[PDB]
A paper describes a structure:
Prenylated FMN consists of an FMN molecule modified by the addition of a fourth non-aromatic ring joined via N5–C1′ and C6–C3′ linkages between the flavin and prenyl moieties. Following binding of prFMNreduced and formation of holo-UbiD, the cofactor undergoes oxidation to form the catalytically relevant oxidized [name] species.
Crystallization of wildtype, [name], and R175A [name] [name] variants confirms cofactor incorporation. [name] exhibits minimal disruption to the active-site architecture, with hydrogen-bonding distances remaining very similar to those of wildtype and [name] lacking modification on the C1′. For [name] kcatapp has been measured as 0.28 ± 0.01 s−1, and Kmapp has been measured as 20.4 ± 3.6 μm. Movement of residue 282 during the catalytic cycle of [name] could therefore facilitate the shuttling of protons between solvent and the active site. Both the E282Q (A. niger) and E285Q ([name]) variants are inactive, whereas E282D and [name] variants retain a considerable level of decarboxylase activity. Furthermore, the pH dependence of the reaction for both Glu → Asp variants is similar to that observed for the WT. This suggests the pKa of key groups involved in catalysis is unperturbed by the Glu → Asp substitution, with the lower kcat values observed for E282D and/or [name] possibly resulting from increased proton transfer distances, as the carboxylate group is slightly shifted in crystal structures of these variants.
Author numbering:
A (entry chain A): 1 to 503
B (entry chain B): 2 to 503
The structure:
Amino acid sequence: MRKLNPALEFRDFIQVLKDEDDLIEITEEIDPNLEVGAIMRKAYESHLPAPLFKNLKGASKDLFSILGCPAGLRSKEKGDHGRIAHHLGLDPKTTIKEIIDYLLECKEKEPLPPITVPVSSAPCKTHILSEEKIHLQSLPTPYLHVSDGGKYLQTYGMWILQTPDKKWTNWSIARGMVVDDKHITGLVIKPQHIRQIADSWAAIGKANEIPFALCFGVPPAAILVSSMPIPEGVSESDYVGAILGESVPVVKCETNDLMVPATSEMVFEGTLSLTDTHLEGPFGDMHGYVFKSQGHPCPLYTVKAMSYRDNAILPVSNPGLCTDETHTLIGSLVATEAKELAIESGLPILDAFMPYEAQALWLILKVDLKGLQALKTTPEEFCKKVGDIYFRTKVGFIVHEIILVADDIDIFNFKEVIWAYVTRHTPVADQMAFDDVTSFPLAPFVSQSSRSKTMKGGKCVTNCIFRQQYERSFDYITCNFEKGYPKGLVDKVNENWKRYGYK
Amino acid sequence: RKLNPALEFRDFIQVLKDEDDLIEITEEIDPNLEVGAIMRKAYESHLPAPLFKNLKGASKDLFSILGCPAGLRSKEKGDHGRIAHHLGLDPKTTIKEIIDYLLECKEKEPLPPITVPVSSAPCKTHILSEEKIHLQSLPTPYLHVSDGGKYLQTYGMWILQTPDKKWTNWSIARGMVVDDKHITGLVIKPQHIRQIADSWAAIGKANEIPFALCFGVPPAAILVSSMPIPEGVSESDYVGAILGESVPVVKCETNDLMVPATSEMVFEGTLSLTDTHLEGPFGDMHGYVFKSQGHPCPLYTVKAMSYRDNAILPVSNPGLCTDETHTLIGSLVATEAKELAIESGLPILDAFMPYEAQALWLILKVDLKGLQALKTTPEEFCKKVGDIYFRTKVGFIVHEIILVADDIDIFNFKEVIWAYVTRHTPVADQMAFDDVTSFPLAPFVSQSSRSKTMKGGKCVTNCIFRQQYERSFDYITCNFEKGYPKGLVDKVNENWKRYGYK
Ligand SMILES: Cc1cc2c3c(c1C)C(C)(C)CC=[N+]3c1c([nH]c(=O)[nH]c1=O)N2C[C@H](O)[C@H](O)[C@H](O)COP(=O)(O)O
Ligand SMILES: Cc1cc2c3c(c1C)C(C)(C)CC=[N+]3c1c([nH]c(=O)[nH]c1=O)N2C[C@H](O)[C@H](O)[C@H](O)COP(=O)(O)O
Ligand SMILES: [K+]
Ligand SMILES: [K+]
Ligand SMILES: [Mn+2]
Ligand SMILES: [Mn+2]
């Protein structure tokens, strides 16, 4: 078998998961109407192998297979974050901390802008359809959740938009549903870069004609960085190239000047209008709900051209209850940028993480107690400093509760987090509300209350650092097996376990 | 005959053996740390309970240790089966069914204990008078690093009786060996051990309260010992109702208290509230040993002991979830919490204290039809709820009451945490109670200034959407079992193996 590069090539990503027994090719006919979604949910929820649906009801030979759960969790024996690790070309057993720290290290690497390759060598140019041959309604697009507002073709593809001055090309994920034979609609909302760039087209009189590309089965490093809140003005492609150690190979679109990854499974091209809008949503989302007939108009994308590979594969995320990509990518790439912001701001933080169990609503900051102690501060002042750094930023947008814990908590393990949360904060008294900051409109407690009108508040910083940890050493015993007892005793017990009779 | 694990501690051990849920460790184990460490490993992976048959320093009779008598075990055998066996219930009975059974038992005729012959009573097999009491000779475990001492009393039953003899209380409260004749332990309000002790102090007998301390009692008894049943009600009579028969008892050597005839060990003597000794710290239900944070507690003077051949000390070693301080303490508060909701007219279907929340969170499953009939608001309902629970003994340990609608399975922490984070606005949906009694054991209380006031720091958290207070609100829960029509869910489960899943 060839040497696999799953960060660079979507199909190598598929092969590496086969070789790890982490992918199940389903060859029997599966209905894109709910059945795909339901299988994906069953697989996410027990951390099982990713399904590749090779035989979809209503598919042509090329359009398409579906890959579900591309960044779901899997058994610990294989490395439970192996799928995320493979998007970055890392050892499958890498921890999430290491994943995060690698993304931060790649920020100081030389950015490698994309490299144009010949069209004759680019798999995404194998088939080219011009406008009259665009028939979105004939694609076997999944209907992912009951009461979704339409069929969501765009759950794990990359939108490419570029500023008018050509200086900033943004790659990002935002949901899109098929509206009719030629149109997609989806979220283009503040403070997302896709809206920022669309607005820069509006600012010069071209709100009804913004060029885009939508690419599926891009280099897995590209799709991951597509979900990451990197800074404005920074073209994702260049940071992808630093992650990969090589420039992303690209080709020009058929109908505009945008560059698309040469190994994409499927490329859609066209223009976006902010002034022609269509009812969109609802969509089963990151917090675990479909709220019925709660759609709202969004912009229309007119598809004008398409290109694709033989036997093309559509990667799909089907969000809901933890754990899926809206938790493993959205949350952790937020936590990555929250750590960066801590470094920028000088907060005494070791790590950051968004527990999956908290539906990417909670941001846990692991506080370096010595560094905290060096500030000579109080919980009230420190919680204010922290909330003020995070809750007015794009990075802090999805976050409604920042939880501060000492450096004895493994924040990446929710058994330790929930322990620290309930045992170390006094309800209400240890929580600081932030009334005036922008609410995340998707939080169900926000959207299903009068706060959906006012758009402000409902966020807090929760102090789970004991008062004495603001001042000095505080040595207590954590009462479990591994931490509670001397290393000699833990080993002795572990060595003799079978001999005792445990079977 | 038939084993009766509810009535006999040794039948309880036998049915755990019969289910491969008990490991008899026959090599030498040190009660210094090693027992407690083995126990922690067992609890934390829901493994078979250890029976330590050969403790360093033990005599032939005093003693073996059974750890984890109410720990959780594999779902295959019934994960709550140890608790079900304390009540003589099917081992696969769920904790909801356990709770509802305890509530049913409240309607049965109470059966007070019946005296049986001393000659037949196992707990009278060996009898020691005062001079032969040597508590330092017992292989008492040192359960956690930095414990204040060796806690003999973690899963036994204190017996105190009011001076007028109308109420005999059975309860568990920790106790450590002080010296060769004395134990010290918690005796705090609002617990009944303290309430009864105070009634003795009011008539000039604070320094001479009769007590008995019993180990390896009838498991139904040790379970009700951890339950906050009403004041004035003798546990023995409800334990009777649970068993379908009177607990068999015998009189103490040195006082008038009645002890279970099948007890493994009985210690007797006098409690003094006014002779105190440094007690603790102890690794307790919230998961911490706070080093050198002991406090003065009453002294128990042991004047007599009796015991069986080959006696067994049952032991609980608390800490991170899950152990008896969560499965018994929490669930038994929940049981009385549900009973209180019924008596107070709240529309509560079920109550539970998730193990993950270290018995600090009480979840109340609200009947939405009942809530809607109230025509109330969240603010009013949260007040009503906190007022009912936080001002009474049953609410003592609980710092946060979480209200959820009837679509949440409160026995499943995946649904509870999902509902918690998604359905309440941080701070705005929380109502603080400032003037209620704090649980002194909560680490956020003990390690703050609130340790000096003992007031406040409790809250009710509203996880019921605003619309659910008024009318129907049909939304889709985005998971496999709830999100999809039943026919599809069944179809996927039937075809799973054929897809290629293994
Ligand atoms: C991984 C992932 C990220 C989604 C996402 C999903 C996934 C799988 C979906 C498709 C399943 C459902 C909803 N999503 C949207 C989304 N951002 C957004 O504006 N609208 C969305 O609809 N995000 C987040 C978005 O990709 C991140 O906020 C990026 O930081 C945005 O890029 P930018 O920083 O360049 O604006
Ligand atoms: C099961 C159980 C219950 C403990 C307990 C433990 C266990 C295993 C320990 C021994 C491992 C550690 C600490 N415990 C104490 C405790 N109550 C108390 O006042 N002091 C305690 O030290 N409890 C709770 C007590 O048993 C319940 O609150 C009962 O409601 C008390 O009975 P009462 O209502 O008759 O007063
Ligand atoms: K991005
Ligand atoms: K009791
Ligand atoms: Mn961007
Ligand atoms: Mn009582």
